[PDB]
Amino acid sequence: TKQAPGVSIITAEDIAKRPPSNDLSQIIRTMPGVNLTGNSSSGQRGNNRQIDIRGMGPENTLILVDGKPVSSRNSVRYGWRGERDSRGDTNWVPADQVERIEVIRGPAAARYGNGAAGGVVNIITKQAGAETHGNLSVYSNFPQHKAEGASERMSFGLNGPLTENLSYRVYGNIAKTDSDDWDINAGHESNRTGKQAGTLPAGREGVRNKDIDGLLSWRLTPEQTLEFEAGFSRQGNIYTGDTQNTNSNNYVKQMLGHETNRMYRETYSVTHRGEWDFGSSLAYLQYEKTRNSRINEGLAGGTEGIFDPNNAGFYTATLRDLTAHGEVNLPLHLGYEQTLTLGSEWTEQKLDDPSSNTQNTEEGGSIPGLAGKNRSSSSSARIFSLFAEDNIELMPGTMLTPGLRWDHHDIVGDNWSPSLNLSHALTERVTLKAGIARAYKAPNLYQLNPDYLLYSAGQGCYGQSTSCYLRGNDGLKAETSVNKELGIEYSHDGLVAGLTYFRNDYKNKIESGLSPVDHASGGKGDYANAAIYQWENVPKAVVEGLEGTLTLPLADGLKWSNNLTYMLQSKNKETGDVLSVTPRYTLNSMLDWQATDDLSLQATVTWYGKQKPKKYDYHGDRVTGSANDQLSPYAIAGLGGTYRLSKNLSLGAGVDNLFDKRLFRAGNAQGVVGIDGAGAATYNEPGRTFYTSLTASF
Ligand SMILES: O=C(N[C@H]1COC(=O)[C@@H](NC(=O)c2cccc(O)c2O)COC(=O)[C@@H](NC(=O)c2cccc(O)c2O)COC1=O)c1cccc(O)c1O
Ligand SMILES: [Fe+3]
């Protein structure tokens, strides 16, 4: 099946029948347990939603490509409210060159370590065969409303041998998603008066992609395989007015329709793969270098995350990420039949950010231990990791899998992430799964850095209206989560029915602090001697919910599939406010008709449950008026087909959002001075959209 308890596979065939515009988040998000959310509840950068597993937020969703981490979003400033001006890390690999996507949720994911507390998404690429194969894929959509940005996508692939013991695979992608019109939210915006009269919450950012990958596989012996690959990708945006607080100035307007951020992502990887009688061996070296070039933004209050007109022009943040991994796999014949895996991991994150550490102390007064100008640009962390998995068969059908992961973070210290996963054949048709693990989150290099300094004159300060600083804190503990899950699945002759309960107990969630630790000295007028908050560890939080799947073969030619997410609870146990904003539930429903040998037809519906905003503003006080707005449940329906013209040529065509259900970003969730809040109404849902596709392959 494509759905076991805790796990989902998306195949190449699935990608082709529900083609994504551009980014894979579109299809990844239809798996059980998966939402498309921001990281916290501000609604800041709310059209920049990313993959969330079990409401643990997208910082706790680890993206791999062929088992190798993507860290590129770690190059974008992490803001006061736990959001980056980032589109996330699911748009580096082009849809049509993906063989399959693996989603691993909760206790089964903890064994991957740092940032898998929600889960792992592993995007797997198509590889060389015994012969040469290749493809040319093109997709083009056509929105009903011209405001909304159309998408165009062209990707090739080409793989095969060179010698009897040398293989290669290459691909390249060129794609563009046009931005929404600067004015798409006009007449839908929250009430904006005084200085902020005229301001707009923005529609979806556009992006231009250029992806090129080369791989050489070398199997110099029957038992021994050696892979070298390099990756070059480039995303440039099309700016449509997006700003942290939905405030505007003249620089912002100058940049409507222009590239204001570019990400270059370069990966080189060496991978050796061993298979001999004693068992299996795998080790890799990845060097990921990300250049995040964007227009300077301010770091104070309502100037946080708007283009700074006094310091016009681009800066470039640089992320050098180094990953090396070793594992072996030992069949053991013992008093119980089992398979043992032993592994080290080593990672280094260097971050050079020439912008984020430039907030100065002239207004709020100076901060003992923090230089007011020319602070370091530099951050780094090394994690060393050892782990073993023991995959024990107690009696045929049953598996017990205990694993220990230990990590040395060179700042935060030692972490112990133990795990245990049971699966039980009760019947040849019914399987019970239970799992309890403690997953791991190392603080990000922004949270961790005492040189990283934000300021507010009050409006953003917890439990007061006075000026305050927020400061990085190298004293922070790692976030840990005891991810529990209990689940049952019936499977027999493509009849699949399964339901999982999950509870993640969340300890030391890192977040802008609630109490001043200190007070600065000096500065100007009423703002002088500002309060100092740090990034704190929140003692306790909880997420809880249900994952369901049901697959019925109506007839031979015809398959009815459903995936269900239901979010029971999401609670910061300190403040009692929500962690994420998700829909209460999500049901994805596909009907797949194999109408002919050659013609396949697809109907889909997605139902989103109610969405409620945060109860408390940045002060910790209760929000009022349009800050309380909720989004009603709504559904999006679609038809598509694929008509195979030959072994060499297939055509696709369809319609997303048949009944043109549309939603509009009204702004951020809470009121500020002159900008009423928009509650849960923080993103744009696109309208009816026709799409066509063509795939030629040998
Ligand atoms: O969303 C926030 N602002 C809005 C709304 O804020 C306002 O409209 C005013 N604002 C306050 O009255 C305020 C009264 C008491 C305390 C304030 O902080 C006020 O801002 C004026 O500030 C501004 O116009 C700008 N602002 C600064 O230049 C600033 C410079 C340095 C330091 C600042 O604090 C600044 O605001 C932009 O502010 C905005 O657009 C916002 C969020 C998070 C934290 C904030 O502080 C925000 O203000
Ligand atoms: Fe302010």
Author numbering: 24 to 721
Q: How do the authors describe this structure?
A:
In Gram-negative bacteria, Fe3+-siderophore complexes are recognised at the bacterial cell surface by highly selective outer-membrane TonB-dependent transporters (TBDTs). The structures of pyoverdine, pyochelin, citrate and ferrichrome iron complexes bound to their respective transporters FpvA, FptA, FecA and FhuA showed that the ferric-siderophore complexes were bound inside the barrel adjacent to the plug domain, a position thought to be poised for translocation. Pseudomonas aeruginosa, a serious opportunistic pathogen, does not make enterobactin but does possess a TBTD outer-membrane protein PfeA, related to FepA, that binds and translocates Fe3+-enterobactin into the periplasm. PfeA has the same two domains (22-stranded β-barrel and N-terminal plug) common to the TBDTs.
We constructed four mutants R480A, Q482A, G324V and R480A-Q482A (double mutant) to validate the observed recognition site. Each of the mutant proteins was purified as described for the parent protein, and crystal structures of each were obtained. These structures were essentially identical to that of the parent protein, which confirmed that the mutations did not affect the folding of the protein. Co-complexes with Fe3+-enterobactin were obtained by soaking for the R480A and Q482A mutants. Apart from the mutation itself and an additional water molecule in R480A, the mutant complexes were essentially identical except that the B-factors of the Fe3+-enterobactin molecules were higher reflecting a bigger mobility or a partial occupancy of the ligand. Mutant R480A showed a typical low affinity-binding curve profile. The weaker binding at the first site is consistent with the higher B-factor of the Fe3+-enterobactin molecule observed in the complex crystal structures. Two single-site mutations (R480A, Q482A) of interacting residues revealed weakened (but detectable) binding in ITC experiments, behaviour predicted from the structural model and consistent with a genuine-binding site. We further note that in order to form this binding site, the protein undergoes the same conformational changes for all three compounds and in Q482A and R480A mutants.
